[PDB]
Amino acid sequence: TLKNKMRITLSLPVGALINCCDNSGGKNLYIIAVQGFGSCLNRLPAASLGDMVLATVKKGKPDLRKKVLNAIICRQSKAWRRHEGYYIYFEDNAGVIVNPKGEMKGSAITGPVARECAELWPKLSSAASAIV
Amino acid sequence: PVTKFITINLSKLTHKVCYKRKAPRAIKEIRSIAGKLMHTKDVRLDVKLNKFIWSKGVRNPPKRVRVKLERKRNEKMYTIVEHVMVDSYKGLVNEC
Amino acid sequence: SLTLQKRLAASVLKCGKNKIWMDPNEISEISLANSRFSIRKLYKEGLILKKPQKVHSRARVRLYKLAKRKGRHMGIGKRKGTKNARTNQKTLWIKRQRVLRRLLKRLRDSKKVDRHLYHSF
Amino acid sequence: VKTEACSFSEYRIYPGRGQKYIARDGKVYFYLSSKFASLALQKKKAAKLRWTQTWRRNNKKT
Amino acid sequence: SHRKFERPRHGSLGFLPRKRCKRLRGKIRSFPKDDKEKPPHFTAFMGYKAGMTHIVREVDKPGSKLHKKEIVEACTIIECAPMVVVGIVGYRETPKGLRILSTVWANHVSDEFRRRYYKNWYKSEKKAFTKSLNVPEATKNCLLKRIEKYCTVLRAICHTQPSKTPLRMKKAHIMEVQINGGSMKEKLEFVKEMLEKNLPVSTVFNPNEMIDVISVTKGHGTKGVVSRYGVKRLPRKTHRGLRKVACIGAWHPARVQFQIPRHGQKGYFHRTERNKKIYRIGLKTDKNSASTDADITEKKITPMGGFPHYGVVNEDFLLLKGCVAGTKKRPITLRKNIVPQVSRDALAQVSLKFIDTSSKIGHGRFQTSEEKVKYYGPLK
RNA sequence: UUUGCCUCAGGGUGCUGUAAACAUGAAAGUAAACUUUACGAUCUGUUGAGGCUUAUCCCUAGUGGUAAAGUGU
RNA sequence: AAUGUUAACUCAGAACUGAAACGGACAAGGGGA
């Protein structure tokens, strides 16, 4: 409920296709915009976990396809810093479908999940499947 | 003509130049070192010495060659460059 | 300087101009050699020697042919031409036809087979 | 101060240098740097990787 | 007409001209101010490239997500080959600026300092400072009395001693360090005791204060606009190359403005870095100085494997926030802050957890060579 | 520009990585004699050891050298 | 019904191996609606 959100290394620019790793029925997200991105002339908006991401479902349920939804990107293939003396990164690029208010629309996430957003939106703490 | 002991590290002399000039650069650096060390403008490399550093190829001359150089009394002075071979340079400190 | 002598000596050994050799010293004795006969006697006494063609052995694939007979490279990935390009299947058919016609001729020389059971096979 | 032990490596972990990698299964994996995770992520074996203490244990040379 | 799409200009115009610095040392434009209420003490120090590293800490800022949990930080540990104080300069204010009244030299001057006054010291007669150091004390008392009566700024000429460092250079670096305080009549005594000796830092350098760093950046020679100002590369289809600024100005004014990025020198610039808070006090010889009671191992300021392109460090250590400009072996000038602060971090008490000791060159595996030997035991 | 510097060497730190040899050792299984005898990607024990490592890495009053001194004021 | 002299490059499966990787250079279609 407080907005102390910490720095993270940037990856996944607009146009990236990532896995869904959730049971909402979508398979992949196509990133069309990241929220909180300001104005740099030729800069491509790139994804931040604590920020939402506007995405479209290219493969998955038709009820989920052909529209722009919000996703929270959880697992990244680029190393992102922490005060813990070590960064954190993974092998897949993944993000979970959520509503604009922040809470998840599915029920479970297959792989590991991002803990930084689960208290940004308190309902993902309850819906958290297997945190790393 | 003075008795000495030193070598020549050709790696640090040809390390900057390109593939096509490694051996000629080693020749030129050997001549320059001999001239500067023996205080003579007249330096002559031996045909065997030219043989040796062109043998391994243009791309890679030998890394190191052992020198203990002897001048010659016949402007008035001139030097002929030579070498001493060893299986392992390790432990071969400079001396007289 | 020593271009005329080189050209003339190229016509005595019947070799190329790049095959005329001397001693490291005495490098003026060929100017002294204004006649091919001098190089000839110098050759007889042994200071002209066409450099032997460098060492080019053969065993590298002479062992490897027996190695592929052995059968390590008998996989399907050392072949670059098609099945027909390596061995012409028309030639294979011709070889087979010659072999069977020779045998059919021998069998009729020995009369092991009659005509009735000769044409049928 | 307390220092942990790596997954592939065995030396202590000094905060201020590190990274963290996690696979799809959700299992935790701790190492020291990209060179200390590169062959791990490239499906290699510490029984054959000569230059660690795992090969020592797999060739009984302690 | 106007630009279709606006974007901020490339580079800062406040660092022009981007030309080579005229000197190698980092000169100080301005020293911290003085006040009447404040008591008289020292003002600045100096040294060489010492090291800017991490040190493990813990936040106490009320409301952070780290707070009690451990953090990693970044700061610098500084070098002090003891500077030698050899001179005093008096300056007085005039409408044309601040002007020298006189400078008084110490009765005995070192040879490293004397070497700076020469371009060929080996071939010289070493006659510098030979008949000006045997003046009577009467002239000293006759003009230092004028110093306090007329001058308002006092500076101490100090010089480094590179012989205590692995530097090839033998000439000392010379600078002047201000002295700050309150009322003039309290300075006459305080400027009369430390006028010959070398400089121990701990007199003024204290925890929980801010200081600044000043030096000369690395040199890179002539570089294009793409590297000097970071302009956008032109598309690959460009005819006469793509590493340039396309339009260097409009038709009018019929000239090239000085704000247009152009090719030229980059690096070897003069820079000052602000807002570096000092945190800890230490020494050179003492053994329990850098580590803490939570780690209680054995190691100090000492490096490992040798400092690449520098050598070995055998002088004092402290702790200060930040990282430092310039190349290895470059002289670094350390000033205090110009004005301290009273905010949360300004009043925040500071204490570390662990200090690195490893092979800071490349990716080594062993921190202390004692553990390096022990963990391997009987080897070849 | 002689408590310096260059050079080489010793050492250090590293870099790939275990470097040559030994084998009535194993060595897939292979062929020649009346149980032994002609190859064999490698490891096994010296081998967490060789080659390279400033040319812009570090240390060494280690040693070989450090030369003619021309121009201006 | 059989046993002796003498000239192919096509297939096959079991191994193990070598840094889970290989027409090793050269040479050599991007496909689809």
Distances (CA, A) of C21 to C6, C46, E377: 10, 11, 65
> Looking at strand F, which nucleotides approach a protein CB closer than 7 A?
1-2, 4-15, 17-18, 43-59, 62-67
Whether A31 contacts A15, CB under 8 Å: yes
Q: Do A91 and D28 touch (CB under 8 A)?
A: no
D50 C-beta less than 7 Å away from strand G:
no
Distance CA E75, CA E52 (A): 6
The pair of structure tokens assigned to C79 is 């072949």
Count other Cβ atoms within 10 Å, centred on residue E148. Answer: 15
DSSP E9: P
**Which residue's structure tokens are 């020469």?**
E118
Strands A17-19 and A11-13: unpaired
Alpha carbon separation from A19 to A16, A53, A54, E364, E371 (Å, rounded): 10, 14, 14, 37, 46
Distance from residue D48's CA to nucleotide G18's C1', rounded to whole Å: 12
Q: Where are the beta strands (DSSP E) in E112-173?
A: 153-159
Contacts of A32 (CB under 8 A, 6+ apart): A14, A15, A54, A55, A56, A68
| Contact call for E72 and D14, based on CB within 8 A | no
Give chain D's length: 62
- Is the Cβ of D62 closer than 8 Å to some Cβ of chain E? no
Q: Return the HEC string of chain D.
A: CCCCECCCCCCECCCCCECEEECCCCCEEECCCCCCCHHHHCCCCCCCCCCCHHHHHHCCCC
**Nearest-neighbour CA in chain D from E54: distance (Å):** 7
**E108 CB within 8 Å of a chain D CB:** no
Contact in structure between A85 and D18 (CB atoms under 8 Å)? yes
Element (H, E) at C29: helix C29-32
Distance CA A46, CA A63 (A): 27
**How far apart, in Å, are the Cα atoms of E222 and each of E26, E267, E268?**
22, 9, 11
| Omega cis (within 30) before C52 | no
A79, A89, A111: residue with CB nearest D26: A111
Strands E56-58 and E70-72: antiparallel
Q: What is the resolution of this structure in A?
A: 2.8
- Which residues are CB-neighbours of E252 under 8 A, at least 6 positions away? none
Can you give the length of chain A in residues?
Answer: 132
Please calculate the CA angle E10-E13-E16 and round it to the nearest 5 degrees. 120
Q: What is the 3-state secondary structure (H, E, C) of chain A?
A: CCCCCCCCCCEEECCCEEECCECCCECEEEEEEECCCCCCCCCCCEECCCCCEEEEECCECCCCECCEEEEEEEECCCCECCCCCECEEECCCEEEEECCCCCECCCCECCCECCCCCCCCCHHHHCCCCEC
Cβ(A70)–Cβ(A98) below 8 Å: yes
The two tokens of residue A56 are 């479209």
Angle at A81 between CA A78 and CA A87, to 5 degrees: 70
- Beta carbons of A4 and E63 less than 8 Å apart: yes
For residue A123, report the phi and psi dihedrals to the nearest 5 degrees. -75, -25
Helices C36-45, C3-10: crossing angle, 10 deg rounding: 70
Distance CA B68, CA B39 (A): 15
Q: After which residues is chain E broken (C to N over 2.5 A)?
A: none
Cα angle: E267, vertex E271, E274; to 5 degrees: 140
End-to-end CA distance of chain D: 28
DSSP-derived secondary structure for E145-162:
HHHHHH--EEEEEEE--G
Half-sphere exposure of A112 (CA within 13 A, CB side): 23
Residue with tokens 């001549």: B31
Q: What is the DSSP letter of C34?
A: -
First to last CA, chain E: 77
Residues whose CB is less than 8 angstroms from the CB of residue A55 and which lie 6 or more positions away in sequence, other chains included: A29, A30, A31, A32, A68, A69, A70, A71, A95
Q: What is the distance in angstroms between the Cα of E289 and the nearest Cα belonging to chain A? A: 23
Paired residues of A37 in beta bridges = none
Q: State the Cα–Cα distance between residues A3 and A81, nearest whole angstrom.
A: 18
Touching B (3+ Cβ pairs <8 A), the chains are none
H or E element, residue E345: helix E344-347
Chains contacting E (3+ CB pairs below 8 angstroms):
A, D
d(CA B39, CA B35): 6
> Would the CA dihedral through B60, B61, B66, B68 be positive or negative?
negative
Residues within 8 A of E (CB atoms), D 1-60 only: 1, 11, 14-16, 33, 35
Torsion angle of the four alpha carbons E56, E60, E62, E67, in this order, in degrees rounded to the nearest 10: 40
CA E302 to chain centre: 20
| Residue E338, both tokens | 């110009």
User: Which sign, positive or negative, has the C-alpha torsion D39, D41, D44, D47?
Assistant: positive
Q: Which two tokens stand for residue A125?
A: 């703490």
User: Is the preceding omega at residue E253 within 30 degrees of 0, hence cis?
Assistant: yes
Rounded CA separation E333/E159 (Å): 12
Interface of E with A in 36-65 (CB under 8 A): 56, 63-65
Structure tokens at E289: 């100085």
Candidates A89, A110, A130; nearest CB to D21: A89
For residue D33, the chain E residues in CB contact (below 8 A) are: 363
Instruction: State whether residue C52 is helix, strand or coil.
Output: coil
Cα distances (Å, whole numbers) of residue C113 to A72, C99, C101, C104, C120:
89, 17, 14, 9, 11
CB A70 within 8 A of CB A117: no
- Mapped onto helix, strand or coil, the DSSP state of residue C108 is helix
* Cα–Cα distance measured from residue B45 to residue B22, given in angstroms and rounded to the nearest whole number: 17
Instruction: Write the single-letter amino acid at D13.
Output: I
Alpha-carbon distance values, D59 to D9, E58, E70, E272 (Å):
17, 44, 40, 57
Q: Which residues pair with E357 in a beta bridge?
A: none
CA atoms within 13 A on the CB side of A34: 23
C-alpha distances out from residue E233 to C92, E76, E236, E241, Å: 65, 36, 9, 10
User: Could you please report the per-residue DSSP string of E30-93?
Assistant: -PPP--SSSPPEE-EEEEE-------EEE---TT-SSTTSEEE--EE---BPPPEEEEEEEEEE
The single-letter DSSP state of residue E355 is -
User: For residues E315 and E51, what is the distance between their CA atoms, to the nearest angstrom?
Assistant: 13
Task: Determine the distance in angstroms separating the CA of A23 from the nearest CA of chain D, rounded to an integer.
Answer: 15
E55/E72 Cα distance (integer angstroms)? 6
Alpha carbon B64 to chain centroid, angstroms: 9
Q: And the tokens for B61?
A: 């001359």
Closest among E213, E212, E193 to E203, alpha carbons compared: E193
User: Which residue type occupies E1?
Assistant: S
Using DSSP's 3-state secondary structure scheme, residue B10 falls into coil
d(CA A89, CA A82): 11
Specify the DSSP element, H or E, that contains B72: strand B70-72
Contacts of C1 (CB under 8 A, 6+ apart): C31
Task: Specify the residue for token string 């005995």.
Answer: E108
Residue E6 three-state SS: coil
Query: Rounded CA gap, A121 and D24, in Å?
Result: 24
The distance between the two most distant Cα atoms of chain C, rounded to a whole number of Å, is 91
Report helix, strand or coil for E335.
Answer: strand
Q: Rounded to 5 degrees, what angle do the CA atoms A69, A74, A75 make?
A: 125
Phi, psi of E163 (to 5 degrees): -65, -25
List chain E residues with CB under 8 Å of D35: 363
Q: Are A75 and A49 in contact (CB under 8 A)?
A: no
A77 touching D, CB under 8 A? no
Residue E222 phi/psi, 5-degree rounding, is -80, 130
D15: preceding bond cis by omega (within 30 degrees): no
State the Cα–Cα distance between residues A95 and A28, nearest whole angstrom.
Answer: 8
Tokens at residue E143, please? 């003009």
- The gap from C-alpha E25 to its chain's centroid, in whole angstroms, comes to 9
Give the C-alpha separation, A4 to E64, whole Å: 7
User: Beta strand B64-67 with B70-72: parallel, antiparallel or unpaired?
Assistant: unpaired
Q: How far apart are CA E258 and CA B25, in angstroms?
A: 45
Nearest Cα residue to E330 out of E122, E49, E13, E142: E49
Q: For residues C18 and C83, what is the distance between their CA atoms, to the nearest angstrom? A: 46
Measured in angstroms, the CA of D26 and the nearest CA of chain E are apart by: 24
What DSSP string runs through E221-276?
EEE-HHHHT-PPPPPTT-TT-SSS-S----SSSSS--TTS--SEEEE--EEEEEEE
Q: What six digits make up the tokens of B8? A: 């020549």
Neighbouring-strand partners of residue E160? none
Is C8 in a helix, a strand, or coil?
helix
